[PDB]
Amino acid sequence: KSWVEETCESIDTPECPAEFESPPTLLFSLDGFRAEYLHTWGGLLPVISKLKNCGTYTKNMRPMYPTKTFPNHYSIVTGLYPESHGIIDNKMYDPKMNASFSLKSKEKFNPLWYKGQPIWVTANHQEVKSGTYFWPGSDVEIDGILPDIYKVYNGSVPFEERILAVLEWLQLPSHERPHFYTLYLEEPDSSGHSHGPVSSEVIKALQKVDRLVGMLMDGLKDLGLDKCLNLILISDHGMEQGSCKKYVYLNKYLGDVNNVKVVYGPAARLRPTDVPETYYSFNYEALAKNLSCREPNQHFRPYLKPFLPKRLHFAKSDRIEPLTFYLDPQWQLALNPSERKYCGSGFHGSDNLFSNMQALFIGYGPAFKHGAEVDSFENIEVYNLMCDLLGLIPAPNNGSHGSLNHLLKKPIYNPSHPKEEGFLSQCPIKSTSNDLGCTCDPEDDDIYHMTVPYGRPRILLKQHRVCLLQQQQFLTGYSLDLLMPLWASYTFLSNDSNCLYQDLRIPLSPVHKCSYYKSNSKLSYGFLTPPRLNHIYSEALLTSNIVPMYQSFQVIWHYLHDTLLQRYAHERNGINVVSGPVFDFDYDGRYDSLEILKQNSRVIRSQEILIPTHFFIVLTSCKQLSETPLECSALESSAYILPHRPDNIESCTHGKRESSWVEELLTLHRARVTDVELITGLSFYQDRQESVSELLRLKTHLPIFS
C-alpha cells in the first residue's frame, strides 16, 4: 500500500532508523499555489489532502509584498521583510551599484544583492549540513557560504528527477548527510500564468504536483522515513486573473515620454531614465501629484515610498523606487502596451492582503500536530520555525519568535514579554497657573483598571521620560521629553470649540495655548480622547490630551470617533481604545531616536513643533459579543496606522462623499498590533491572561481583503 492509501497515524515520538539522531527538515515549494486551490480542488488532490488532514494546515498564509517568487522565497528562508533582505522584485535596480537585477542574468549570481542570512547559512555557522535543490539564493554564495549540496537553477531538469535527487541524498553517510533540505517546482505558477487560475491546465497541474508529492512520500516510506521527517509544504504566492480591459497605461496621462522607466505589474514602480544622474534629482512629488485623481474611479494610486500603508513594509531600501503604485485587485500598470509581456494572463504581485494572493502552508511530521487548523500567519514567521526544527539559534529577523508555537507538539522556544526600558517618573501639581487665552461657552485603583483593562502599555523606549496621568475617563502616558502624550487609553461602552484647560501636572509649552492656533494656518490640535464622552466631559480638554494635527486630517479623526467608533461599540458590545501620535520620519517602520527626532522638528507660527507622521489607534473587543471589554474571555483586536497628511489627495475627496472615502482609508491602512508596537516603542496586552505565545499570535494577525 502506497503512503496516500494508508490512513492517518499519530507520530507523537519520531520513529527514526539507525544512523539518524533527529528527523531532518524538508522545505517543499510549489510556486504559484494559490490558497484557493486547495480550498476548492481538495477532492482532486488526494496526496495534498492527506497532508492537510494529518498535519498543521492554515486556510491562508500571508506572503510578502510584492507577491513575486524571488522576494517571497527568500523571505521564507531569511524571515526578513523584502525591504531589508535586498530582493525586492524579480526585476529591480540599485542606484548605488548602477546595476539591474534579473532571473535570467549574470547579475543574479552577484552576492551584493542578497542581504540578511538564509537558513542554510545559519545552519552552516552552527555546524548543520544542508542540501538544497533550486531555492532562490542557493546558487549564490552569501557571506561566502554555499550549501553542502546545491544546484544552480536549471528549469529543464524534470520534476521526477528532482525528487529522486533528494531521495538519494537521504542515503548519504551520517557525517555527510544534510539535515536541512529544499525542493522547488515551477507549478502551478507556470500553468497559472498561461491559462488562468480557473482552467483545465491548472487542474491538470495541481494533479501533476499532487502525484509528485505522493512520489516523495512513497519514496520516504520505502526508506522507512515516513514517520521520521518534518515536511513543510509551502508556496510563495497566489494567482490572479488579469484582463485587457483592466490594465493601466501611463502614456495616456504623460504621453509617449522616454524620460521615465516603468516596471510593469500590479506593483508598479517608476524611475527616471537618466540614472543615477537624476535618480534623486528627479522630483517624483510633482509627477505623483500630477497623476492623482484623473479618473472618476481610478484603479491605481500614485504613492511616494513613505506614503504607502505601513503594513506593507516597503520603503527602507535603495532598490525600491521613490514612486510606487497601488492597484485594485485584477489590475496591472505599465508605461506602454509594448513593455508588458501580456495583459490577459494569470498574474501576481498584487496587495498581499488580497484573497487570491494568499499562499499554501502544510506542516507534516513528528514535530507537527495532526489535523490541527490554525489562523493565518506571515511567511517571515517560518524562518524561526525552521531554526527550532533544526536546533539553530535564529539570526535577527522580523518574525515574532514563538508566535507559531501552537503548530508544534512539543514547542522548543518559550517566549517572554519585553522589559520596560522607559524611565518612568511621576507628575505632581507643580506649575500654576498660566493664561491659555481660550473662550469657553457655558478609589483611584478602581478607575485605573477600567481605563486599561488589559494592562497599561509598557514603554519600550530607551530611555524615554514618561509620566502616567490618571483621569476619570482615560489614562494617558505623557512624554516629558517631547511634551505631548505618547498614548491615551479609554473604554467606550455600548451605550454611554476653541476651549482648553491647562494640565497643572505638565510643564507649560507655548503650543498649548489656544492663542497659538489661528484660523488661517492649516495646522491645529486634535484630541486623542473624544471630549464628547459621557453634559460634556471636560478632562478631555486638558492640555495633555492634545496633539498637533492638520485641519485636513481632522476630517478623518472626528468622523472616526463621532460615527464609526459608536457603530463599532454597538456591533462589538463596546470597544477599548488606545490612540497616539507616530513619529517615523526615516520611514523604516521603527520608532525614531531622540537624535533624528530633533532633526525633523519644524518651526511654525514662530514656535518649534514636532509634528506626527502618523496616528495609531488600536480597537479591542471581546470574541463573545455577550461580554463587555472589561470582562473578555478572549480578545478581538484591530489596529490602524493612519498617515498624517496636510491634504486628502490620497482619498480623492472630490465628489464629496465623506462617509465612503474615510472608511476606505481606514481599511487600507489597517495594521498588525505588532506594527504599532514596532513604530511607537510600546507593548500591549502584557497583563492579559493569555500566554505570551498566544498574545504574539493575536498581535501579528491581519484580515484578508475579499
Ligand X SMILES: *[C@@H]1O[C@H](CO)[C@@H](O[C@@H]2O[C@H](CO)[C@@H](O[C@@H]3O[C@H](CO[C@H]4O[C@H](CO)[C@@H](O)[C@H](O[C@H]5O[C@H](CO)[C@@H](O)[C@H](O)[C@@H]5O)[C@@H]4O)[C@@H](O)[C@H](O[C@H]4O[C@H](CO)[C@@H](O)[C@H](O)[C@@H]4O)[C@@H]3O)[C@H](O)[C@H]2NC(C)=O)[C@H](O)[C@H]1NC(C)=O
Ligand Y SMILES: Cc1cn([C@H]2C[C@H](O)[C@@H](COP(=O)(O)O)O2)c(=O)[nH]c1=O
Ligand Z SMILES: *[C@@H]1O[C@H](CO)[C@@H](O)[C@H](O)[C@H]1NC(C)=O
Which residues contact Zn ion by CB under 5 A?
31, 69, 189, 236
Name which position in 187, 236, 378, 588 contacts ligand X (CB under 6 A).
588
Choosing among ligand X, Zn ion, Ca ion, none, which partner's interface includes residue 586 (Cβ < 5 to 8 Å by kind)? Ca ion
**Contacting range for ligand X; rule: CB under 6 A; set: 244-252, 386-394, 582-590, 626-634:** 582-590
Among 120, 134, 478, 616, the residue binding ligand Y under the rule CB under 6 A is: 134
Residue from the set 10, 13, 40, 98 that interacts with ligand Z by CB under 6 A: 98
Residue from the set 7, 154, 200, 258 that interacts with ligand Z by CB under 6 A: 154
| 689 to 45, 76, 310, 402, 412: CA distances (angstroms) | 41, 31, 29, 17, 22
Distance CA 706, CA 704 (A): 6
* Residue 56 near residue 232 (C-beta atoms within 8 A): no
Residue 156 CB, nearest approach to ligand Z (Å) = 4
Alpha helices in 66-155 (DSSP H): 69-78, 82-85, 119-125
Q: From 64-72, 153-161, 186-194, 445-453, give the range in contact with ligand Z by CB under 6 A.
A: 153-161
Task: Name every residue whose Cβ is closer than 8 Å to that of residue 641 and which is 6 or more positions away in sequence.
Answer: 309, 310, 311, 582, 614, 615, 616, 669, 671, 675, 676, 679
Q: Which residue has the cell 486599561?
A: 452
Q: Which residues between 393 and 432 bind ligand X (CB under 6 A)?
A: 396-398
Q: How far is the CB of 130 from ligand Z (least distance, A)?
A: 22
Enumerate binding residues for Ca ion (CB under 5 A). 584, 586, 588, 590, 592
Cβ–Cβ under 8 Å, residues 540 and 474: yes
Q: Is 80 in the site for ligand X (CB under 6 A)?
A: yes
Q: Is 90 in the site for ligand Y (CB under 6 A)?
A: yes
Q: What is the DSSP string of 76-91?
A: HHH---HHHHS---SS
The owner of cell 483592466 is 246
Stretch that binds ligand Z, among 18-26, 154-162, 436-444, 598-606 (CB under 6 A): 154-162
Nearer to ligand Y, 134 or 661 (CB): 134
Indicate whether 240 belongs to the interface with ligand Y (CB under 6 A): no
Stretch that binds ligand Z, among 151-159, 396-404, 411-419, 628-636 (CB under 6 A): 151-159
Our finding on whether 607 is near ligand Z (CB under 6 A) is no
Nearer to ligand Z, 253 or 280 (CB): 280
Instruction: Supply the residues annotated as catalytic.
Output: 69
**Binding of ligand Y at residue 527 (CB under 6 A)?**
no
Residue 159 has what DSSP assignment?
Answer: H
CA distance 537 to 527: 12
Query: What residue type is 25 in one-letter code?
Result: T
- Choose between 157 and 244: whose C-beta lies nearer to ligand Z: 157
Question: Contacts with ligand X: how many residues (CB under 6 A)?
Answer: 12
C-alpha cell at 125: 555557522
8 Å CB contact between 649 and 621: no
User: Per DSSP, what are the bridge partners of residue 671?
Assistant: 639
Beta bridge partners of 378: 62
Q: State yes or no: residue 33 binds ligand Y (CB under 6 A).
A: no
Min dist. Cβ of residue 256 to ligand Z (A): 23
**Peptide bond just before 296 cis, omega within 30 deg:** no
What is the C-alpha separation between 617 and 452, in angstroms, rounded? 14
Q: Count the residues of the shown chain that bind ligand Y, applying the rule CB under 6 A.
A: 14
Identify which of residues 314 and 478 has a Cβ nearer to ligand X in the complex: 314
Is-contact 358 60, C-beta < 8 A?
yes
Q: Is 84 in the site for ligand X (CB under 6 A)?
A: yes
Q: Is 705 in the site for ligand Y (CB under 6 A)?
A: no
Exactly one of 153, 501, 568, 585 binds ligand Y (CB under 6 A); which one?
A: 153
What's the distance, CA 595 to chain centroid?
27
Residue 569 CB partners (closer than 8 Å, separation 6+): 492, 493, 494, 495, 575
* In contact, 214 and 47? CB cutoff 8 Å: yes
* Set of cell numbers at residue 70: 524571488
* Nearest-approach distance from CB 202 to Zn ion, in angstroms: 12
Q: Which stretch binds ligand Y (CB under 6 A): 140-148, 183-191, 335-343, 464-472?
A: 183-191
Cβ-based nearer residue to Ca ion, 177 or 590: 590
Torsion on CA atoms 605, 606, 608, 610, rounded to nearest 10: 10
- Shortest reach from residue 134's CB to ligand Z, in Å: 11
Residues that bind ligand X (CB under 6 A): 80-81, 84, 116, 313, 396-398, 588-590, 678
